[PDB]
Amino acid sequence: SEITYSDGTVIASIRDYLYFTTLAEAQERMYDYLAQRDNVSAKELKNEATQKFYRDLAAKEIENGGYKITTTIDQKIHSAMQSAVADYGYLLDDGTGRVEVGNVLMDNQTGAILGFVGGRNYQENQNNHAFDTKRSPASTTKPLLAYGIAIDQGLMGSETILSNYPTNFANGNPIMYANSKGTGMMTLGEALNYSWNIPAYWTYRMLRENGVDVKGYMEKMGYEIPEYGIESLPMGGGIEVTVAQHTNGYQTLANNGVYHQKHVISKIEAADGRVVYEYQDKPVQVYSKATATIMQGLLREVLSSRVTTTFKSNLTSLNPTLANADWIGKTGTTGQDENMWLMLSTPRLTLGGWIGHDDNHSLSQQAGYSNNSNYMAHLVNAIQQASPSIWGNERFALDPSVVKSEVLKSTGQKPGKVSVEGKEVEVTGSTVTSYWANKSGAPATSYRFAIGGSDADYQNAWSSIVGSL
Amino acid sequence: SEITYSDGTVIASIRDYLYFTTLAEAQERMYDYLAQRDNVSAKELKNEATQKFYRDLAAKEIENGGYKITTTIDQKIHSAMQSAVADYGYLLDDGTGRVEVGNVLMDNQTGAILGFVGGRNYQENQNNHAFDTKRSPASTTKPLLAYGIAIDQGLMGSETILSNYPTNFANGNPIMYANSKGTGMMTLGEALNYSWNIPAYWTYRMLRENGVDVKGYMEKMGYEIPEYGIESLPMGGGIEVTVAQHTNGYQTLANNGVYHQKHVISKIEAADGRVVYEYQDKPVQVYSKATATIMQGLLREVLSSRVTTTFKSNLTSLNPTLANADWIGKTGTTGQDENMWLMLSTPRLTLGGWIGHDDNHSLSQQAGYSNNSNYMAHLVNAIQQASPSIWGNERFALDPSVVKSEVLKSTGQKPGKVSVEGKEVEVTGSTVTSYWANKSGAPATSYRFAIGGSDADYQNAWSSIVGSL
Numbered sequence A, B: 001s002e003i004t005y006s007d008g009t010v011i012a013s014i015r016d017y018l019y020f021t022t023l024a025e026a027q028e029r030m031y032d033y034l035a036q037r038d039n040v041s042a043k044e045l046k047n048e049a050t051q052k053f054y055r056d057l058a059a060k061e062i063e064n065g066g067y068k069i070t071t072t073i074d075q076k077i078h079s080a081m082q083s084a085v086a087d088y089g090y091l092l093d094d095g096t097g098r099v100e101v102g103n104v105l106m107d108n109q110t111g112a113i114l115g116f117v118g119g120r121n122y123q124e125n126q127n128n129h130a131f132d133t134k135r136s137p138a139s140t141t142k143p144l145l146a147y148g149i150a151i152d153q154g155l156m157g158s159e160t161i162l163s164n165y166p167t168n169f170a171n172g173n174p175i176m177y178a179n180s181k182g183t184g185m186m187t188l189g190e191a192l193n194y195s196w197n198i199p200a201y202w203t204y205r206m207l208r209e210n211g212v213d214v215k216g217y218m219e220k221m222g223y224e225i226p227e228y229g230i231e232s233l234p235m236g237g238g239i240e241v242t243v244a245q246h247t248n249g250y251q252t253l254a255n256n257g258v259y260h261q262k263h264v265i266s267k268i269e270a271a272d273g274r275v276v277y278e279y280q281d282k283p284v285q286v287y288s289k290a291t292a293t294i295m296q297g298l299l300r301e302v303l304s305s306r307v308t309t310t311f312k313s314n315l316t317s318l319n320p321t322l323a324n325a326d327w328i329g330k331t332g333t334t335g336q337d338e339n340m341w342l343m344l345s346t347p348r349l350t351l352g353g354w355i356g357h358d359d360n361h362s363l364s365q366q367a368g369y370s371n372n373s374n375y376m377a378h379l380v381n382a383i384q385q386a387s388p389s390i391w392g393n394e395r396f397a398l399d400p401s402v403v404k405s406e407v408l409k410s411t412g413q414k415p416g417k418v419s420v421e422g423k424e425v426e427v428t429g430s431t432v433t434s435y436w437a438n439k440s441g442a443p444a445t446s447y448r449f450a451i452g453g454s455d456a457d458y459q460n461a462w463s464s465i466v467g468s469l
């Protein structure tokens, strides 16, 4: 029995992450095969005695048999990923103790996993941080569950305005971001580049208000969220994900909105060639192409702006020609710096990244902004050196079907009269193209122009807007 | 034109709360009458120009006409309520500035409002704190939205056990109560008497898990809650209510589960006797009688235990014979002592009570426990002196249909073997009657016995339980 890379080169016959991860998935596939083959009903398969016998059966069936398990893993790439974490993993240590890590590199067109990083060192710690451990995705939830959906429902567009004025959770506590209680109105791009929380809160509220099927979106991408009624959901509250699953969500946006399920096994077959298992592809249009490519545009600037990650500086210095590939991405940060994420894509690959501590104590303030950003730049450069064409040179581009409205920079809506405490006002001033994913684009400017805001908020907002005309 | 008390005695012809409150409701009733009479379609009634003309019409129609508006108000009672707040209202001032107040006294069998208190003094402050201002009900939400429903769905019973171990909101913050992060397991009665938050959190979660129609319950009682997906809902988060509306919810539990809509107007009629308006009664069985009378039992002890209110001590001293009537009740307290409530019933009346500040700054720590408790005791004694039989001498009593199970005091479930990390254990020790509102009563003891709790929680819990056998 052997496990091979994707070219058939043997990984091992039946002591690191690659081996145990591929062996485990293979055993799962063997278990279904065997239940079926023996005509075990999904009823009798609910007995835990029979389950356990079939799992041991599937294990021995691999040890003893002459099976050929074909993984998606790319051997040059996955080795380079291992060398990189061995050489540069110390760069994650931020003086809060040893920092753990997981990464998963995914082909955007197939869902196939090319290489991953399970942790700093299997021999010192076995936990698989790429495939098993589950942590809040934090703000990398935003592009998926809040803004992406709002755009796909045609409820906002790329230059739409949101409230980031102070507001509280229903319990009375203020919604914090770092240690800021909020500012004022802002565009979607500034909310994204900075990653503020209040714009996201208000976005999910608007989704709820319009009864949007938010679950439907998330389940099409294989996310399991037990409870959607949670004020902080769009910031990562009440969600817990593997790096492998989460990469798959960023693969959806990368791939112009088309989900392909993740996999590390493509095929199992007996020595005589019987196909015991075969990955069956199953594409799903989760976001409209308009949505996904507008979103790519915004995420490009998350990395260019360098607000919450230094990544592009780090990569520019290691590999300027690679830094000019069309990178997009989003960071995340939990409320006490327990977890940092960085999600990266080009049109070809998505690289997912998490760091944190196995027991969930805090990292330093900058573990995400700087350390993980620097580590990942090294990791990305290692992958490129090992396979020079793999990230590709293609550009993300707006899909023909995107609609483009002309809007006021200050309302993110079309100019036109509006009512302010008595008189109608000629709503005027500098303008910008906004990208929408509906039929009509952006609407007439109306008073409640932003996503969110209280009466005083708008009183203050409209005061400022007026004195500029 | 005149407004009368319920005996026909004239209040006024067309300068305090009584006048403006009764005039306002009467004008609303006149508006519907007139729209109808003139054959104005609910379409044309959506025009705000026509709305405004009909509201001015309805106002002049009262000034000019010879209408006889019959209120539910009891004249002796409502006067005594006004004297009481004038004499004793200074008892609310807790050194956080002038404290405002509202109360509403409701007949449990009719919904009729007998008397209310709009504030400390109309001449100094017009705001109607009984009928217009809206504030979180805080923990007085619990009996209605969390425990009452759980019991009515047959998901818990009176001695059922809940977790009050530490746990966080989905955002990472711990659920606080005063400045405690939690303790351990506890019975429903201790959770109620103390008013802890974590047992309620876990209760609403279990309701959500079983897809219970919680909205259905709350809307039958006339509550408008815009969003049910809120972790703190059962503690008062995301709800805002008048004292009049909230009294009506406590009227539902008082009246063995049968809602009657609140009203201050019973009848409007023209000089020649034409009935322009008549209150039409509309009873609804919101909770089963089993639920409502079990709940009465628990709420009796909220006041007897004197944990979160001194009320019974205060009343015992002013009027011991009245203190022996069968009082039940619940306090509430917002997260920064912005609002205090006390809800009181006997089988005949429900008295609702709020205090706080018009601008929502904090009250002192004890404004609810002590000051409002003392004020209300005075208010209740004033009402009794003015109408001696009005609170009545009846007892709340368990309804025949309540089921009574024998359960272990420590699991609040029936004794029987259970699995603890290996061996099966003879689950034993002292016992208690638990009251249920289903067909079967309490179930077999199983491992996850409490409402809520994490794996460690139960590890700790079961450790303690074991070493006692």
Ligand SMILES: *[B-](O)(O)CNC(=O)c1c(F)cccc1F
Pocket (backbone or CB within 6 Å): A136, A137, A138, A139, A140, A176, A177, A194, A195, A196, A197, A232, A235, A236, A237, A331, A332, A333, A334, A335, B170, B171, B172
């Ligand atoms: B983001 O990581 O920049 C901001 N997100 C948050 O503050 C957040 C979490 F990461 C997780 C739960 C709640 C929350 F607000």
Ligand SMILES: *[B-](O)(O)CNC(=O)c1c(F)cccc1F
Pocket (backbone or CB within 6 Å): A170, A171, A172, B136, B137, B138, B139, B140, B176, B177, B194, B195, B196, B197, B232, B235, B236, B237, B331, B332, B333, B334, B335
């Ligand atoms: B109760 O008033 O004793 C406890 N309730 C609360 O802590 C609470 C509120 F009153 C309002 C919102 C949230 C919350 F936890």
Ligand SMILES: [Cl-]
Pocket (backbone or CB within 6 Å): A016, A017, A018, A019, A082, A118
């Ligand atoms: Cl490995």
Ligand SMILES: [Cl-]
Pocket (backbone or CB within 6 Å): A016, A017, A020, A021, A118, A126, A127, A128
């Ligand atoms: Cl592993």
Ligand SMILES: [Cl-]
Pocket (backbone or CB within 6 Å): A005, A006, A007, A009, A073, A074, A075, A076
């Ligand atoms: Cl390979």
Ligand SMILES: [Cl-]
Pocket (backbone or CB within 6 Å): A169, A171, A173, B169, B171, B173
């Ligand atoms: Cl909070």
Ligand SMILES: [Cl-]
Pocket (backbone or CB within 6 Å): A212, A213, A214, A215, A216, A228
């Ligand atoms: Cl949903």
Ligand SMILES: [Cl-]
Pocket (backbone or CB within 6 Å): A222, A223, A224, A225, A240, A241, A242, A245
């Ligand atoms: Cl998931």
Ligand SMILES: [Cl-]
Pocket (backbone or CB within 6 Å): A227, A228, A229, B229
């Ligand atoms: Cl929901």
Ligand SMILES: [Cl-]
Pocket (backbone or CB within 6 Å): A025, A262, A263, A264, A265
């Ligand atoms: Cl797989």
Ligand SMILES: [Cl-]
Pocket (backbone or CB within 6 Å): A066, A270, A271, A272, A273
């Ligand atoms: Cl074979």
Ligand SMILES: [Cl-]
Pocket (backbone or CB within 6 Å): A285, A287, A288, A289, A290
């Ligand atoms: Cl499309």
Ligand SMILES: [Cl-]
Pocket (backbone or CB within 6 Å): A303, A304, A312
């Ligand atoms: Cl750049």
Ligand SMILES: [Cl-]
Pocket (backbone or CB within 6 Å): A306, A309, A310, A313
């Ligand atoms: Cl930088």
Ligand SMILES: [Cl-]
Pocket (backbone or CB within 6 Å): A357, A358, A359, A360
């Ligand atoms: Cl650790």
Ligand SMILES: [Cl-]
Pocket (backbone or CB within 6 Å): A404, A405, A406, A441
């Ligand atoms: Cl346009």
